[PDB]
Structure formats: structure tokens, C-alpha cells
């Protein structure tokens, strides 16, 4: 009945691999708080894992003020990349809040797809020679 | 006097930090055993760590029978690379016993040095996807 009981079900289904029943749970947590910031993150992660890139992207687009403290540029870039919106995914990655090695690897891929192969080399070498 | 006391002293310096003293200890082990395959391997490693690339390369080039069935190609290429004998390092790598990741990363670096950028990029991408 309690919200922390549901988060335990999210992580059971998450570790299990069942991302559809994990999304079911995450929406119940969103029924409680329609702006639970951890819930909005885990919705996107599930939706991305289900191939639902256009709606996972939609969640992030209509929750900017709510997600200002933790902006999800990587999830957005990725969503845009998988939908073949490469120039979009480039804008997202270069604005991106904070750098990670997964954000860098995606920047590489975007530059590879844009035939910008010297910039891409630098990204991939940086990555390998930390 | 005893050999397992020396093999313990190598490990003390080697795993700690010092490789100058670790080198002399290994040459004590080589007075006794003429062609100790593990001591020859340790000489090469210690020599490389001291920047004595000509020497290490010569240890390999004149102990090819004794140090056979033994992955020395990376050590050999690395020495060639650090001596700015890039084409030699390239050949050493391209004929190498058993390819590995660090050997792959050196191959990339060797191609970058030859301005063979497109092949380089391929190597670094392959390395990041594994």
C-alpha cells in the first residue's frame, strides 16, 4: 500500500528484466506524486527499454521545470538518436548538463553519423585514453 | 644466496614502485639460471619501466628460442613505438602472436602516428564497443 513498497517492486522487476510491469508500478507511484522526480526518471528508462522513444521523449519535454534540478539530456539525446533526429541529438548532447562516459560515447556516434570524423576520433581517443 | 629470496625481492620493488633495484635483483637471478624464461620476461618489463627500450628490445631479439611460446609482441612493439620506429611497431603488431586490448590500443596509436586516421578511428570505435 505504501510508496516505498512499490519502489521495491520497481527494482524487483528492473533486476528481473521485466520493464513492462516495472512501468505499470512506476505509473502508480506517479498516481501518488504527479511530480515524483525519481518516478519521472524511471518512466523514461522503462519507456526507452520498451522502445517507446517518442513518448519517453514527450515525458521529458513537458516536465522541464519539474526536472530542472536533474535534466535528462542523455536520455533525450538517446531518444532523438534512436528516432533518427541526429541534428537534434547533437544540440541536446552539447547543451547537456553534465558529462559522462556514456554521454561521450553517444556524442561520438552522433559525430560518426554526421560524417564529422576528426571530431569523432578525438572523442573516441579521449574515451579510451581517459 | 637462495633464489626464492630474490624472486620475493623483485616482487617487493616491482609491486611497490622501484624498478631500478628490481632490475639488478633480476640480473642476480640470471647469473644463476642462464636462460630463465620468467627472469628474461621480468628483465624486459623492468627495462621498459626504466626507459631502456634499446636494451629491452635486444633482450627479446637475442632470446627468441628461450623466450618463445611467450607473448612478447606488445613489449616489442611498445619499444619500437617509444623509439619512434613506428613502421616496425606496426609490423610487430600486425604479425603478433595473440591480439589483446592493450595491443589493440597501441595499434590505434601507431596508426594515428602514421596519419592513417580512418583506420585509427575504426580501431578506437571497435575498442569502445569491444
From Swiss-Prot, chains A, B:
<feature type="repeat" description="TPR 1">
    <location>
        <begin position="3"/>
        <end position="36"/>
    </location>
</feature>
<comment type="similarity">
    <text>Belongs to the SRP72 family.</text>
</comment>
<comment type="function">
    <text>Component of the signal recognition particle (SRP) complex, a ribonucleoprotein complex that mediates the cotranslational targeting of secretory and membrane proteins to the endoplasmic reticulum (ER). The SRP complex interacts with the signal sequence in nascent secretory and membrane proteins and directs them to the membrane of the ER. The SRP complex targets the ribosome-nascent chain complex to the SRP receptor (SR), which is anchored in the ER, where SR compaction and GTPase rearrangement drive cotranslational protein translocation into the ER.</text>
</comment>
<comment type="subunit">
    <text>Heterodimer with SRP68. SRP68-SRP72 heterodimer formation is stabilized by the presence of 7SL RNA. Component of a signal recognition particle (SRP) complex that consists of a 7SL RNA molecule of 300 nucleotides and six protein subunits: SRP72, SRP68, SRP54, SRP19, SRP14 and SRP9. Within the SRP complex, interacts (via N-terminus) with SRP68 (via C-terminus).</text>
</comment>
<feature type="region of interest" description="Required for interaction with SRP68">
    <location>
        <begin position="1"/>
        <end position="130"/>
    </location>
</feature>
<feature type="repeat" description="TPR 2">
    <location>
        <begin position="101"/>
        <end position="130"/>
    </location>
</feature>
<protein>
    <recommendedName>
        <fullName>Signal recognition particle subunit SRP72</fullName>
    </recommendedName>
</protein>
Amino acid at each position: 500500500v505504501s510508496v516505498p513498497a512499490l519502489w521495491s517492486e520497481v527494482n524487483r522487476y528492473g533486476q528481473n528484466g521485466d520493464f513492462t510491469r516495472a512501468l505499470k508500478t512506476v505509473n502508480k507511484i506517479l498516481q501518488i506524486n504527479k511530480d515524483d522526480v525519481t518516478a519521472l526518471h524511471c518512466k523514461v528508462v522503462c519507456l526507452i527499454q520498451n522502445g517507446s522513444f517518442k513518448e519517453a521523449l514527450n515525458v521529458i519535454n513537458t516536465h522541464t521545470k519539474v526536472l530542472a534540478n536533474n535534466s535528462l539530456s542523455f536520455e533525450k539525446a538517446y531518444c532523438e538518436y534512436r528516432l533518427n533526429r541526429i541534428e537534434n541529438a547533437l544540440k541536446t548532447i552539447e547543451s547537456a548538463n553534465q558529462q559522462t562516459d556514456k554521454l561521450k560515447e553517444l556524442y561520438g556516434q552522433v559525430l560518426y553519423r554526421l560524417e564529422r570524423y576528426d571530431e569523432c576520433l578525438a572523442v573516441y581517443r579521449d574515451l579510451v585514453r581517459n
